[PDB]
Design a protein around this ligand. Sequence first.
Ligand code: 2TQ
Ligand code: 2TQ
Ligand code: 2TQ
Ligand code: 2TQ
Ligand code: AKG
Ligand code: AKG
Ligand code: AKG
Ligand code: AKG
Ligand code: AKG
Ligand code: AKG
Ligand code: FE2
Ligand code: FE2
Ligand code: FE2
Ligand code: FE2
Ligand code: FE2
Ligand code: FE2
Lengths: 253, 271, 271, 271, 271, 253
Amino acid sequence: SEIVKFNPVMASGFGAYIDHRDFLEAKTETIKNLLMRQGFVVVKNLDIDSDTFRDIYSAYGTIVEYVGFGYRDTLKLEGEKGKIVTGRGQLPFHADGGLLLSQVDQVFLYAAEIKNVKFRGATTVCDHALACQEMPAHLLRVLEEETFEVRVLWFKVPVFTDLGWVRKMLIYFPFDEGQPASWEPRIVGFTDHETQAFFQELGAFLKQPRYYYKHFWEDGDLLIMDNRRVIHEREEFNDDDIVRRLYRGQTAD
Amino acid sequence: SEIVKFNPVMASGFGAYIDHRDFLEAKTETIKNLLMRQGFVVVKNLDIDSDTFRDIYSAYGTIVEYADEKIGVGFGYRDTLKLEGEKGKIVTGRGQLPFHADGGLLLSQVDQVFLYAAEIKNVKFRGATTVCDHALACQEMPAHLLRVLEEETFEVRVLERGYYVDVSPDGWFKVPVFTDLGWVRKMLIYFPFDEGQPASWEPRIVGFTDHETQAFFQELGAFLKQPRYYYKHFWEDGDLLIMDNRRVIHEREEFNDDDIVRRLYRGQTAD
Amino acid sequence: SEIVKFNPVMASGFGAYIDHRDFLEAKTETIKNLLMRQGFVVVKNLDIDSDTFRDIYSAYGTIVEYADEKIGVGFGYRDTLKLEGEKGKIVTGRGQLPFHADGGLLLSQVDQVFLYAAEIKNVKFRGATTVCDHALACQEMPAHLLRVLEEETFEVRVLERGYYVDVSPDGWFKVPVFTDLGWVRKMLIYFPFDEGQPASWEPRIVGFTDHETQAFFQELGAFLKQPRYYYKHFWEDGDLLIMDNRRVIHEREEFNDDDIVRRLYRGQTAD
Amino acid sequence: SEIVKFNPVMASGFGAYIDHRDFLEAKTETIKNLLMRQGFVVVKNLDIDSDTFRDIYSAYGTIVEYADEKIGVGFGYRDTLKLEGEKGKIVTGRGQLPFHADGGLLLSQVDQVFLYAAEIKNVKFRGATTVCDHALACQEMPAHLLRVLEEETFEVRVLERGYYVDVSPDGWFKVPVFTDLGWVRKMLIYFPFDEGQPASWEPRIVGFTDHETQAFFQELGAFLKQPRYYYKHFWEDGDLLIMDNRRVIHEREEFNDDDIVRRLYRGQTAD
Amino acid sequence: SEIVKFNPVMASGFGAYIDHRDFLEAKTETIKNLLMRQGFVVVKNLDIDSDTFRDIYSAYGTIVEYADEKIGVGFGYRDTLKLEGEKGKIVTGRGQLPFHADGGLLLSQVDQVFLYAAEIKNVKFRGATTVCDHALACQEMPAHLLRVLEEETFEVRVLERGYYVDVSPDGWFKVPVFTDLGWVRKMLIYFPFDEGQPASWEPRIVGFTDHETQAFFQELGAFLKQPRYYYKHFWEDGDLLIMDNRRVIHEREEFNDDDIVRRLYRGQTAD
Amino acid sequence: SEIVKFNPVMASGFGAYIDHRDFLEAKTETIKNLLMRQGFVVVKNLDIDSDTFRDIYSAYGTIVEYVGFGYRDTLKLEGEKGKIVTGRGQLPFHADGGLLLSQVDQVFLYAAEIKNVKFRGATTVCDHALACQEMPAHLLRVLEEETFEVRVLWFKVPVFTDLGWVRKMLIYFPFDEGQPASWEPRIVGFTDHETQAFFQELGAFLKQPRYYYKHFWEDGDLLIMDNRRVIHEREEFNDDDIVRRLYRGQTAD
Ligand SMILES: O=C(O)[C@@H]1CC[C@H]2CC(=O)N21
Ligand SMILES: O=C(O)[C@@H]1CC[C@H]2CC(=O)N21
Ligand SMILES: O=C(O)[C@@H]1CC[C@H]2CC(=O)N21
Ligand SMILES: O=C(O)[C@@H]1CC[C@H]2CC(=O)N21
Ligand SMILES: O=C(O)CCC(=O)C(=O)O
Ligand SMILES: O=C(O)CCC(=O)C(=O)O
Ligand SMILES: O=C(O)CCC(=O)C(=O)O
Ligand SMILES: O=C(O)CCC(=O)C(=O)O
Ligand SMILES: O=C(O)CCC(=O)C(=O)O
Ligand SMILES: O=C(O)CCC(=O)C(=O)O
Ligand SMILES: [Fe+2]
Ligand SMILES: [Fe+2]
Ligand SMILES: [Fe+2]
Ligand SMILES: [Fe+2]
Ligand SMILES: [Fe+2]
Ligand SMILES: [Fe+2]
């Protein structure tokens, strides 16, 4: 049972900054373990190609393809115009994957190339377990008792999947007006007014600095998330001068 | 001197969730006492009618009622006010009621306020009754806000003439912000209605311009609405919410959707 | 309803330091009110004699006094007790008085207690009067301690017969730990004297062995003595310490050095 | 996933009080899940015999039991251990069991530990079972204490030969303090017994002197016993305490009074 | 070393309220010292003319003044600047002055800044001078905001040419955000003016777009304005506000109401 | 104005752990600055001889000799039997140096050789500024208003010297019974009983983990303190098997 050197990201003690050399030398298991309780790992100054990226993430478990024969492993998020996920707009709060064979345990994001962007296109991370514990009861009640449905632009998405150590969160926040949308949420028995108001209020609570981390990208950055322990978002970068190229990997057990 | 089981509502330890059986079996004095320090009580799944509701609340003191020459108040409800979201009404209407304490505008002492949900339909995230821990808020408030509350003169004018008849004063009258009862400084304050919400009353601050008064209420409002001090009650059939009117202030949030059914019964007591 | 300037004593906001001019100019009601929520008041550099001391405290309510058939209590002090560190005495002696509330053992209601330092000499770090914020302590206390206080039967027996005469009961008698006044649960508790300190009274807990009772009081004691709840007043000439007897409990620490001069005047009021 | 209603035990939010009816109606998986994050569950007012106790705990996984070859372990209890304060025994005796995790000394994995109060008499403030939130404590621990736990080699020797027979290793053997399970670093540690308490086991730290090890454990113990991390359970008939043995460590405090009746049932499960 | 009596302004312990008599009797060095750790001092009820104001502030070090060659700076004030809300001016105008430190744009070192209220009329909730505890804020700041402050190049351009004449550099020039003095990282930063407010200066960040810079300042401003770091001073006649310009940054909020009289004296000193 | 990478030692944010390479590469001024607000610096794995130790510390200002001609620079604290300061017993809470020309601004301690000790002979550091701010008023009153005198085994030692950014503390706690003592404190107008009780109570408050750091020594450890910002203590190591050899340097401006 080995230890890796890290520093917490949040004041709560959540998250982990790891030096690139310490990360590279650590056993896969050591990082996989730390991620479960720290939620996310931030590594800077990591000069690697796409093949090394795959060598790194594939060791964490079975690759989740984005039938499959193992080829759709690394997703290139390069801000392609006319796309949503691989596009240039917002991705509101969500977790990756779904249930059963489509579940995702770990998500890896690596910055291949970043140019002309300093305060847009952040990837954000929310400590949902701590947030749900400290949340006003009227917000937590909705998450725990009401049926959340989603339509791809209706099916039930169970908000909480109790794994004991965490309640894995699956949720899909609405896109901001003006943003190209791939999904639309609703809450059974709530009006449009009520659902809009709920997501606005919940979104504001989840974005408080105690729970919320904003990662602004630099070449060689690696962001790893335990997809069961955090939820995440991409902020818009809709300027054509911006170059933002990330590689995405996903693993599960 | 007896004890009732309860769970705190607020992270601070303020408020009281009480199981309906525990509430019903408790002596009136036990609940009346707890309210002084806990500010408010929340009971769910209480199955009672209006007569039993009165039996419960009347035991807490002298019923605050408007009869004889005062029969005009609240359109002649006498004791138990029916808040049923009626069109063309404000207090008993479908819009917001901003932060207030009961009784003040009618120059009546109100110690306890009781709200029971007779019927709630097609509303999940509107029409909340909200509760503020003002003692703790005043203790932790930025000095420039507390100063205004402690030192400046607040005046109110009523606007819903059908509700207040001639029991309320005619024009602008002074409402003392704090009344020192020792164990608490009872707060009597009357916030401005949001733009677009029909206004039952209207506040001003002497020596302040309209620009300053608006800015002050909005800033104070945002402070008081922080989760540390602020509880939002979303109504279900059989909910009972009791407030110590000296220890908390409260609001109703708008429910201006025609499909909503929201009928509450309201009782008031004082000593 | 009027305001007195003060600074909190405790980091929690509890307690009140009041400048002597501000205290003297304030109405009795202003101070009486503040005590209910602040628990205690500290005034320094007050230059008064015993007659003026009585003029001040008697305004707070009905003087708790022992005359006629009760003239035996406290060796015939009647109203203002002189605590002057007399040999062969306990309450008015030179040793510890463990955590207690006033009045309880004599079956008298005491709301406010006043202590004025007439003369203090050759003491800088002994002979403190200490004050505990019991409401906050009970709120934050470990459950296994609070349970005992709320559920078990506490009994006391007096030992200083010359002080309590026949006004106190003869043997062991029940003292209710909490009396619910709503705004506070008034605490009546009587801690055991430390080994080596002459004992004016003695507690027991029904159903507990001597081993368990000793362990409980020591553990509770250490909890109550934490800085968050606990204020230590080291006396200087002209100090006035006022306590709301329903809102705090207090102790005196030993001053068993013959060179020490420690003379306090004590008044008590109730409604 | 189903939700069981509970209230936190610790101010931090750790631990779970669950109503006996809510507990009985809950799916095993619901409680088993909750235990991983809450560390321990406290249920009062259960009325169950030894067979029903077994039916409840056995559903949580594979029963940790010692039969056939390992029949000597625990003086032949097999599955449910009866801790009844037997004279001349230690684990099932009347003395202290210092901070520990179950199973480790027998080289058995134990995930959940169950303790039910069959009979308790003449004890109110002794014989407690205590629980430590070790994950929070390690996170907030002074660095000089955590360093020892993370970097030094901890060895243990089994002393109560009748309890551990030949299943436990002979002489000193290394027990790893932390085992990283990702969601938690499982703690395996075996504190030294107080002087005067019969010792079932004995710890040492390689490279440390006897006084360094004694000093370390004394200081670490005091830190872990702070109320932020520490819960004391005083037993009553029908109490059920469940612990996730990976998430908390626990102790028994002595009850060496002849009049005390203290009989607990113990079950253990693992996956 | 002498001690001046004071009360903290912020809940954190930062800032100092000092009684006017205590202030006047205090040695200059005592106040000068206290300011380094308390950031700012607030004195009320001073009755002083402009000459006495100068005598007080000039004792704190070398007067930061602009005479002879630099006589054009501040429209020829020399030592004491009169901020009297003059139309067609900005610094001495009636609008907002956003978060800043004094001196930096003129390339002058300023250690202490003094502000005295000569005359204030018809203003109760506008025209505040505000103070930010930047050391605490930077320590608790979200990492994405602090990174910009520590790593990016901040440039400023002077716009109110009449105020800064030829002493300020022409066009865009780099201003270092942090200057490490050991005891503090002195902050030099110049926030953008709100739209509708006449701008005395203008910031940019090298490599940032206009909307990135605007977005950064909006978010940073909101964080710094949290009551934990932020004090709002609403002026009355005889108020004195002193700031250590190395330890805090400050702003003026608009007072663009014609009826408002707001005349402040300003002094600056450095070593 | 340059920055050095560090991690806080205390949960309050006080103190600084610095990696040995980062420390060696940092400018003297950068460390000297950080020490003023962080109180103390901890560096591990520093393999240097006595001459390099001197090269390092002498750059911080004027060397304070332990008349002088500059030769008594590095004090060797090697646990010599029959000595106090360079002995094997306790040194209770104190700051180094005195006033005027004998003042000490920075104290450096380096572990040349450490053997047979794991839980004795710690050097401890107290955040006195934070402690004085949060202290019960009855404790702070004594420190602020009463005269403290010391006798070498009577002269006034001013408790607080107000430097603005800090109140520099000079104080000399009594030695524990059984420990060889080089000084003895008293408080004017307090009895022996009262003074003993005060130091006991104050000592307990100052040793709470919020304010108090314990450094257990390893070969190559360097502990630097800003002597104006912290007070410190040595815990006994009175076992003859223990090897504890520290080099001490002191600088002032
Ligand atoms: O108590 C009342 O009946 C009325 C309704 C609005 C509330 C506030 C006040 O004075 N009253
Ligand atoms: O109030 C009293 O006179 C007495 C003295 C001790 C105190 C506690 C109590 O019942 N009394
Ligand atoms: O799990 C067990 O049966 C035994 C009893 C003592 C406890 C600690 C340990 O290894 N065991
Ligand atoms: O210090 C000054 O006189 C000028 C006025 C505005 C303030 C900010 C700055 O560089 N100055
Ligand atoms: O582009 C990013 O920052 C993350 C994209 C993402 O969340 C996803 O691919 O699911
Ligand atoms: O309808 C409600 O929520 C409460 C209305 C109210 O506050 C009142 O009756 O004064
Ligand atoms: O002497 C004192 O400090 C107070 C004595 C006391 O508590 C009492 O009079 O009951
Ligand atoms: O008796 C108890 O309180 C629990 C004993 C125990 O921990 C064990 O049997 O291992
Ligand atoms: O008018 C004020 O409030 C202060 C103005 C100011 O900061 C300045 O003159 O630089
Ligand atoms: O030996 C140590 O740990 C420090 C000694 C010390 O404090 C000193 O020399 O002044
Ligand atoms: Fe995603
Ligand atoms: Fe109301
Ligand atoms: Fe008393
Ligand atoms: Fe056990
Ligand atoms: Fe300025
Ligand atoms: Fe030293």
